[PDB]
Structures are given as structure tokens and as C-alpha cells.
Amino acid sequence: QVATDRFIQDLERVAQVRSEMSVCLNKLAETINKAELAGDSSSGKLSLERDIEDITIASKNLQQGVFRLLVLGDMKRGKSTFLNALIGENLLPSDVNPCTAVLTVLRYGPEKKVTIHFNDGKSPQQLDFQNFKYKYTIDPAEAKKLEQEKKQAFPDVDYAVVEYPLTLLQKGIEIVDSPGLNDTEARNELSLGYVNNCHAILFVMRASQPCTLGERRYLENYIKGRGLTVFFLVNAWDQVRESLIDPDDVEELQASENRLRQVFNANLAEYCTVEGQNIYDERVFELSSIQALRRRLKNPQADLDGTGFPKFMDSLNTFLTRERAIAELRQVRTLARLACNHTREAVARRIPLLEQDVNELKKRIDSVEPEFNKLTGIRDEFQKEIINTRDTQARTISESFRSYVLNLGNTFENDFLRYQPELNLFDFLSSGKREAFNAALQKAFEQYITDKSAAWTLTAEKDINAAFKELSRSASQYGASYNQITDQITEKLTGKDVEEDNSPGWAKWAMGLLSAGFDWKNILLNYFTVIGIGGIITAVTGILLGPIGFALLGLGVGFLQADQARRELVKTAKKELVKHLPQVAHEQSQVVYNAVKECFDSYEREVSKRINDDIVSRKSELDNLVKQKQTREINRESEFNRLKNLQEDVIAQLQKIEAAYSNLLAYYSHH
DSSP states (O other), X not given: OXXXXXXXXXXXXXXXXXXXXXXXXXXXXXXXXXXXXXXXXXXXXXXXXXHXXXXXXXXXXXXXXXXXXXXXXXXXXXXXXXXXXXXXXXXXXXXXXXXXXXXXXXXXXXXXXXXXXXXXXXXXXXXXHHHHHHHSOOOHHHHHHHHTSXXXXXXXXXXXXXXXXXHHHHTTEEEEEOOOHHHHHTOHIIIIIIHHSSSEEEEEEETTXXXXXXXXXXXXXXXXXXXXXXXXXXXXXXGGGGGXXXXXXXHHHHHHHHHHXXXXXXXXXXXXXXXXXXXXXXXXXXXXXXXXXXXXXXXXXXXXXXXXXXXXXXXXXXXXXXXXHXXXXXXXXXXXXXXXXXXXXXXXXXXXXXXXXXHHHHHHHHHTHHHHHHHHHHHXXXXXXXXXXXXXXXXXXXXXXXXXXXXXXXXXXXXXTTTOOOOOGGGGGSTTHHHHHHHXXXXXXXXXXXXXXXXXXXXXXXXXHHHHHHHXXXXXXXXXXXXXXXXXXXXXXXXXXXXXXXXXXXXXXXXXXXXXXXXXXXXXXXXXXXXXXXXXXIIHHHHHHHHHHHHHHHTTTTSSOHHHXXXXXXXXXXXXXXXXXXXXXXXXXXXXXXXXXXXXXXXXXXXXXXXXXXXXHHHHHHHHHHHHHHHOOOOHHHHHHHHHHHHHHHHHHHHHHHHHHHHHHHHHHTO
């Protein structure tokens, strides 16, 4: 049994396990809800609304959720051949043209349909696959002419969704096939959007040309240090041979492969170490996609030994179905355990109060007021801590920004020189070469700024994370303190009392145990979309190009030689850039402030809600009863039994959920 099937096998197992949990959660929420919509005509509702939705929401996200693979890399690396081999057929056309390719999403569908999304406002055009393919394919002529120019072949085209009945995509896979590194940079819904919310990044490189300037630039800007799981596929491994002095020499070949392997290890090792642990061998794979495509084209089920694929697919398997899956499900059983315990505990307070009435009930409730005040006091003290942090952090990260932005004039030479456009003798005399250069100058500053600000963000992230980790710990304490008070409530109401962390529901959410913890990255990233960036890069830069052209005329370039012109460019550049440093550090620092502010404000808002929902629930649960006793008359025994049944029904669905999880983990442990 080959790795291709073993992956499809495992993947379907998880889908099954996912499917049952979803069915269990639906029956669970339905159970609670039915008990409730029969409650306020019986003994009164336990206030379990907050748990019904969390259950419902989670159930929906199980049936819909899917593993996302984001595929990145330059053109002419065999990215689409790699994907083709992965999926099983020659479906994507090969990425050899800088402006013909367009962002493609790929997912399961009964029939071969393609849904086109546009960028110039017009309605998402839907068309069948062969229809699509014939229209959006250009002839080898037109492609050259558009390429030798500027024009993206489909200006109106944002992104295409392709649905296909590929079996790999059936078992819960989605593939986002991005264009090259530049075109992706140019698109923030990619370089920040998918990069940050996808399960794994598939980075395609070619063996012949290890670690391009452009590749390590991308990796450093968008991947270095933000702890993502990226697989690196060194493609066209079998063509190391072209470069050889003597193509027929095995010793020269092994030498040449070994030092090639070294380059990859020098530049990538750092990307494959997670928490001190080196796992290079489970991330960096030497593939021969073409051989893999050829084989699978002749036989969908062929053995792929020798192509590199079996070892890569194993690791991808273990990551998705053993790590990202066990994680997804762990939280799901926690939610169940929460919903289930909140019911169990609620019925536990209700039962003993049934046979009481009603001045004794009112009396008991009054005896507990000092403590609801204590729960409130926790909400308010944690509230004040969260805000205090959103004020400390938003200030610190703003100054950190100013401080970075002002200190740019220092490491400028070393940093800029690797972007700076070359400028030989009579160039600045020809209006056309002066444009070609000017565009290149445009692109240089863009690249420079993008490198520098991406560098700084990586340093802010570190602080942001450090804060949320400490807020997670306070949530843990306040949670424990919250439980004290909460059992004192159950005691003062009844008389008698009753390794996986059980702090209260809200605390878990606040701790990030239920959902990479709390998703500030996306809060931050959605807020940056509703402003621009955008106006960060190309706009800021434009204020510099004019006055550098001015200055370059002032020292007579066009009559200077590449060496003379170089020297004078950097200096002109530096002098100009520092002329706008104060104004950028002023206007933009306040935008950072507000971003970091909405970050912790967002958290503060969800948390206060969840702590109040709990307090309000607990108050409602008691008050409902009071209203019952005053108004309705009930059969104490019927109700007792209806309420004991609830505990029974719910604890049952829980056991199914816990068994499904249990069985999966047990299958993995012995296999």
C-alpha cells in the first residue's frame, strides 16, 4: 500500500471522526435546547444559552472545515507540475509566464466547475471547466507580446475557484495555488491573508537555483519567525546533471548534489526548527515532480519510490492528520466537556432547591450576594488589567516604531546597496532609459521599505505575543479564583459540596484554549485592510523619486560612469530618505498605536462579554426558579426525573465524542 493511498486513507479517517463529532454536537445542542423550551413552563430554564451557540457554531465548523495548503514559489520552478503530480493529473497549466497566471483555489466538486471572482466589481462569472479553459488560455504568440511589456493578461481577474472531482480533494483538502513571489507580494490578501490562515505552506524551489535573492527575501519578510509550518520542495532534483562539467560522471554528480544540499541546509535550517527542535528532514524534500506526474498519468495508483514524493507525503500526512487534527478535535471535546459540565452543575444546584420554597430560596439567594459581587469584582479587575495592557503595549510598540523609523538613516548604505539600480554612462540622457531606471529606483525603495517594515513587525509580534501569554496566565488565576467563589455559591445554596485544566468556560476562551491562542494576528490584519498598505509602500516612496531625479541632475549624472553614479545615488538617496523620516514616524506611529489598541480592545470586548454571560446566566438560573415557585405549580418528582434525564442524555453524547477522539488517538498510538 503506497503513500498516496495511505494519505487518502488517513485523511478519510479524520473526516469520519470529524463527521461523527458533528452529529454528536448537533444532538447535544438539540438536547439542551429541547430541555430549555420545555423549562420555562416547568421548573424554569437553566440559563444555558451561551453553551448552545458555542456547541452549534462548533458543529457547523466541523462539517465545513477543510485542510488548506498554500502553495508558494517563483515561476519556472515547476510549481504547477508539482501540484499536478500531487493531485493526480495534468490539470494546471505550467507557470512559465509572469503575467498569464492568476491565483487559483482548488477544492472538491462533483462536476468540473470554475467560479471566477473579478476585481473591477462585475459579478463572479461561473462556467464549466472546459469552457473556462478554452477562454482563459492564450496562444504562444499573444503571451510573448504581453510578457515583453507590462500588461497582466487578465486585468479584471482577481481569483479563480476550480472545483474538481479529484479524490485527494474529496477527503478535505483545499489548495491555494499562488502565482510568483512578486505578484503575491503585490497582493496582501495572499502574503498576509492566506499565509496566516492556512494549515501548511508548500514552498516550491528548483534544485538548479537554490535560494534565490527573491526567495529568501520573501521568506524573511513573511515567514521568518512567525512560527508557521512550511514544507520546502526542492524540485527538478534530477537536473543537477545539466550543470556538470562531465554529465556522465557519478562522483562529480554526488559532489554537486551534496554542496547543493548544503546551500539549502544553510539557508533553510532556521525555518525548520520550531522550539529549539531541528526537524529539517521532515520539511525539506527533494522531488522529481515530472517523474511523479508521468507515472501517475500512466497509473493513478503507481508506486512513487525514487521521485521523493513518498517521504514528503508521509510528513505532510503526520502533520495534518496527527497534529493539526488531534488539535482541532481536542478543543471540540473540551467544548463538549464544558457544555456538559455546565448542565450537570446547573441541574445540581436546581435539584435541592426544588423541594424548598420560596422565602428560603429568596433567603439563600440573598446570602450569596456578597459573592456575585466578587465574581463581578473579578470581571472588573481583569477588565482593568486587559485595558492597562492595551495602553502599555500600544504606547511601547508606537515608540518602538518611531525609534526604528528614525534609526533608518544608520544602516542604509549596507541595506540599500543590494537593491540600488545600476546606472551606466549615457543612460540618464535617453528619456526611455531614464524611465527604465526610474521604475527600477521605484522598485528598489519599495523593496527596501517592505524589507525594513516587515523586519520591524516581526519584532512587534514578539511583544504582542508576550503580552497575550501573560493575559492568558491572569485568566488562569482569575479563573481559579472564580471557581472558589463559584463553589461557595453552590455550597451556600445547597448545604453539601461536590490533569486536563478545568478553569471556567470564559477563562478557557480568554486563555485561547478554545477556537495560535487568541487570533490577534487577524484582528490586526482585518483592521489594516480598512485603512491601506497600500498607502504604506508605493505612496510614501513616490515623495522621494522626484527630488532624487532633481538631485541626480544637479551633480551631472548621464555624464558619470556606473561607479561614479553609484556613489552619488546612495548618498542622494540617504539624504532624501532622512528628509522624510520625522514625518513618517509621526503620522504612521499613531496608526500603529490604534492598531495595537483595537487588538487588545477586541479581546477585552469578547472576554467581558463571556464573564458577564456567566454571571448573568447564574443569576438567571436562580431567578427563573423564584418566578416558577411564585407562579406555576409543579410535580417535584416529574421535574426531578426530567432534570436527571438531561444529565443522562448529555453525558451520553459526551461519551460518544470522547470515544471518537479516544479511538483516533488509540489508533495512532499503536500504528
